[PDB]
Symmetry: D2
Subunit: 363 residues, 4 copies
């Protein structure tokens, strides 16, 4: 094969620098990129009319939390609407995020679409005019992007077609982003739906990630200028067998070690349906896993960072402080987790220096 | 693998019936789907302002030719704008086309985009919201679609990535079309640009088409409900070595026989940079080639059907009849050519198959 | 994307001529290549010692049948041992086959081996030193070869790996054969085991063959110099739903039309566990199928041609004539079947083509 | 996809333990598996007769060096013949190797063969009966295997076919080895032949390794139970541009970080045509490269450990100690190099500065 450099040394440096800032030690990502339709159910759960104003207010509430979150948040993913909104004082949200040490991200996919001839499987659309959009988003403050592909574990899924097509579209998206100075977060989410066990999820995750990286290679993707947002390896929601956080961690880390090249700058786990606490405990266990991890293992949480805040807010301006306090608490918790220093309840903690090997050959 | 029927017997029948009507014996396709920018230079060559009215008039000129073109035209591809325009008599163009026994086609791709990391290669965009667009186009009179991918023969092209990616996007487009009752014309055009010889074009065409059909298979495409619009196999536009129409026909039919399954309903050749006469002569030779051809071998010409008509018109309303007469001439010529009954002499055949032209093993 | 001719025009001509002779109108293949282990149970069914002499005698019985089989047998597949044995008169068996107008074939695979990590799936070995073996076999009278891959329909099979691996090994085998002037018969047999229906077999057959031909393309195989030996498309053996022969034929022909390039010279069906009569009726129906079939559709039968002869022989020399008469009858029946002229009233077919109330779109 | 465990937890532990022992810190591999035809050339350079005894003696010379090599050699690769030879004291060589703390390896490939339709490219054979051979080698003292695939950098190479096929066969070989308790060393060597520069070699190496690992994933290979033996990334042997050891180290480590999953236990570099000193210095730089390296980076040298020894021996039984001395010196140097603690000076005469490069004798 012959090389026709997709990127210059300067372009590579920029993407790599951005990727590293997002996942710097102790830092993670706040996923606040819900679209109008996606945020609907959540605002409904608190009797709050879904208007641009209330959406702006909620986003402002999260983005303007006190500086304690600064060393916790390396990046914030915004939905198109939000990227162009301003805080009460007139400061554009992108400026607010940056002033606090965070990198601004933008969701660029246009949702999933059904794959004909499959058992309810999908691929994701959004490539049309993506280059122009990325150039504009870059000019308007964004330095990284988000694109979500979705796979499901079932009797005949994910199928060869679903795996191949989703990996290919992720690669196209990644290529377009990098041509525009935008770091692409590659998100091949395997849903936890089903009654399959832990090892089945690990197997599917391994196969999916192997396909993802072959496709990224085929499309000449600069891995150092990318981030990976995968599901943690866990049993299906309806699985009857029970597992410990250490087992989930071992399966998760083993799967990543067998598929993700060291060159990938970081892994920002999606939390799916996990509760705030569960997502923090699992990430902590993941970082405490004895095995060698050559990439940052952090978070890219939506619900896992907003659940309590959304409830505390309830749509009342008077609850601004209370709501922000809940968000700050999860930001702090997860900052400790991505460093393996989180401990669920108490306020004493501070202890983390010892490791030994026992049984990972079972994975 | 497991089957999850992409189409019901009814949907299959609908698609197969449409595909067969388009390429019925003696029928071909008029490709009049040039976009505003694509038709610009065309009108510019005849000193005619590229306005909606002039474009509307030119299309009217072609679509309203006498009933003599009826047995010659099985389908007409239109650009979005034209699908929603009307003739002077108030009839929408789709109705005009249909009353003459032709099937209405609509171009749905959104142009080519550069593939990063390649030597100027491209893929094609246009999948976003394609399903909704197809459902609407169907409702407005269209029964088939057009999507053009472009590949180029060079020192390092077409690359593995270009072949793989273009084949994949064509399959995605085809899949979406069939879900909406639209017959997709799969167009993987290999440009004639360059000084490569006939053997090289045949080689590249064979590898490209093998990739295209494997992709269509992977995406569960119903071949009977599709058509193929490939480049004929010819030497490069600047190849110093010269060839006969019989050699082009042999190279073309051999390439297709080695890659296109018999289930494909028809092959509608693009004319590329060929003149009106050349395109008719090559198509005729292709149909006279002494090899078994399990699919209709006809035309889907743009320039090869409009060149003279455009020039005769010259943008002057009073040249309507003279311009349409020219179009009818090429329509009738190609109608005979797709049956192997064309002779540049005049009407009927006078120059048939000679003899002793063996050694097809040299291809 | 560059060509480096694997074969010269002369080599292509030789391979194409050989392939055509084997499947010439009315001719099929006698598969008598059972190894010592495979023929053991065959001999014990008639209480006969599995000695080289009895094997030679049995093969001789079939190869020296009267001249009535000449127009019926275009090729005879032999096991290594047999290729070097002689008839009572001292004539090498390959000479015997050739004098009767048959082409000599040789099995070159070395059996199946388990694919680790699969549910009882296999690939086939035999590539080591295969080029040298082919050159020797060619010198010793053989012009075509046999290589069998086996796939099974089950809950998770054929798997992506199994399909990809078997298709790849068949391509390597075919490439080596063509380099030595040997026509390779590509045999990707999908076993009839299981309770799946006709539709599922057709689906799997379609996916398998699509993979086979993409692999042949990737390995630069000259299709005109090859033959295909696939399973007919039938319901599983344990399938509770019944099907007519016309349905088997429609499913079979449809699958082939959707995957086998017309350049392939011929298709020689394996009969699996079908009875002698069943295999003839099905092949006849296949040739009677009203769809366009661009390749010869004939037989490559083992059991379907030897069952009765083996029984009639019983291992007793005095039964030679009786045994040979049984083989000749099946050779005649299938010769008519591969022309669609078979009837339980052989040598006098005329009245045919009755019904019409059908729907190919149901396939 | 579905999991059908290729290995039990016990089998994985055995393979993992073996792999780790071979590349334990400070340890490397002595590749003394030259076939008789290959070693005959080196014995020829010293006017020594290529007899079984001479070969036995030479191998004994290397395998029985003093205990100073013990901490340096984690593994020794042998050719079939040597595996069944004994030292002067009657001890089988495998026992000799084990008593010194080394793991015994066996070459199992049967050499390269030409890929038809390519520009002098090859694949490698040796799969036939490999399972039975591994089981026997395991019983006879071997715990790991060696299989070499060869690729060349040129205008059209390595081709898509060559990359795909070589990656696939390496995967089949690895699969069979693991089923028999043998650790497979995956060796996809990209020859240094040519005038290409460093970045071109890096590009090709990245593409080749990406293909190798995708194939290993497709074939369900347990990476923790494998080792990788790739070429270091260097400019072509005929490249005009000069590079430093730091640059070679940077390109090599970067290519590996972009393709080799952290789960791979170790990388044992081949030296190609590098001199004994050149190979040690580059390995040292590789280990000193400032990038994160999640796998052991050591050696698997043949001539790079035998050059001086072979020259000092000269086929004279009295030069035993002299020869061994040269070998121990190189073993020590590389032992320090794989820990990034090597620094040269005077030692290792001109025989260690001579290029051990020999153009690929084929095309």
């Amino acid at each position: 094969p012959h090389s026709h450099p997709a990127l210059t040394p300067e372009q590579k440096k920029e993407l790599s620098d951005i990727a590293h800032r997002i996942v710097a030690p102790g830092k993670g990502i706040l996923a606040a990129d819900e679209s109008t339709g996606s945020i609907a159910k959540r605002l409904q759960s608190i009797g709050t009319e879904n208007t641009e104003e209330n959406r702006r207010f909620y986003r402002q509430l999260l983005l303007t939390a006190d500086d304690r979150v600064n060393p916790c948040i390396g990046g914030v993913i915004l939905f198109h609407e939000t990227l162009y909104q301003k805080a009460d004082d007139g400061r554009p949200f992108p400026q607010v995020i940056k002033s606090k040490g965070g990198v601004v991200g933008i969701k660029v996919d246009k949702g999933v679409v059904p794959l004909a001839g499959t058992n309810g499987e999908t691929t994701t659309q959004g490539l049309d005019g993506l280059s122009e959009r990325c150039a504009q988003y870059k000019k308007d403050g964004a330095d990284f992007a988000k694109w979500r592909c979705v796979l499901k574990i079932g009797e005949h899924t994910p199928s060869a077609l679903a795996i191949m097509e989703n990996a290919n579209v992720l690669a196209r998206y990644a290529s377009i982003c990098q041509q525009n100075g935008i770091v692409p977060i590659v998100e091949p989410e395997i849903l936890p739906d089903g009654d399959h066990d832990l090892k089945r999820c690990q197997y599917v995750t391994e196969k999916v990630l192997a396909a993802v990286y072959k496709a990224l290679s085929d499309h000449h993707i600069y891995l150092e200028g990318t981030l990976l947002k995968p599901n943690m390896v866990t049993p299906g929601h309806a699985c009857t067998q029970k597992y410990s956080h250490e087992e989930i961690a071992m399966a998760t880390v083993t799967a990543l070690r067998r598929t993700v090249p060291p060159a990938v700058t970081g892994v920002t786990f999606l939390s799916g349906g996990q509760s705030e606490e569960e997502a923090s405990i699992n990430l902590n266990a993941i970082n405490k896993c004895p095995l060698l991890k050559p990439w940052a293992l952090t978070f890219s949480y939506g619900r896992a960072l907003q659940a309590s805040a959304l409830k505390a807010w309830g749509g009342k301006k008077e609850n601004l402080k209370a709501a922000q306090e809940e968000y700050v608490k999860r930001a702090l918790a997860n900052s400790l987790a991505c460093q393996g220093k989180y401990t669920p309840s108490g306020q004493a903690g501070a202890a983390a220096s010892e490791s030994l090997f026992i049984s990972n050959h079972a994975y």
